Structure 1
C-alpha cells in the first residue's frame, strides 16, 4: 500500500483491519524518494493474499 507520511505502523495495521476486515501479522514501512510511505502489510497465514487482492481489485 501507499500511505500518507504522517502514519504509524499501528495506524496502518488498524487501518487495514478496519477497512478490509482482515488480520495483520505485521506492518513494514519505508519512505520512497517521492514523499509517500510504502507499507508492506504481512498478513496472517489463515487468510490468503491473492484472494484479498482479488477483493480489493488488483491483479
Structure 2
C-alpha cells in the first residue's frame, strides 16, 4: 500500500430493472391548462388593467408557477405572455397578471373571451 488509511473500495451497481412496473397506468396531467387557468377576474380595478396596461387578470390554480402560466396562456387563447406576475389574494386563490407582448391586443382577447 501507500497510505496508512484504508478507504472503502469501489464496487459496481446496477440500475433498477423491475420485473413488474410499480405504476402501470400512465399518469394523466392534472395541472392541465383548464385547471391552471380557472377564469379571468373581471373587477373594474382589473378592467382598468385591461385597457391601460395591456394585461389580462386570471385566477389560476393555487399550485401554479409562472412557467406553467405562460405555457397555458399560449396553448389556450393562442397568444403569448411577455411577463406574468402572480400573487395569492387573501381570500385564498392565486391571481395572475398576464401581460401580452404588444403584438397582441388585450382588448381583442378580452372580446374574444368576453370580459368587457
Range into which the TM-score falls when normalised by the shorter chain:
over 0.9
Instruction: Answer 1 or 2: higher relative contact order, Cα 8 Å, separation at least 6.
Output: 1
Question: How many pairs align?
Answer: 59
| Structure-1 separation of matches of 2:86 and 2:80 | 17
Q: RMSD across aligned C-alpha pairs, in angstroms? A: 0.6
Report the structure number with the largest CA radius of gyration.
2
Higher percent of residues as strand: 1
Higher percent of residues as helix: 1
Extract unaligned runs of 5+ from structure 1. none
Alignment-derived partner of residue 9 in structure 1: 66
Alignment-derived partner of residue 55 in structure 1: 112
Runs (4+) off by over 3 Å: none
Extract unaligned runs of 5+ from structure 2. 1-57
| Structure-1 separation of matches of 2:78 and 2:65 | 19
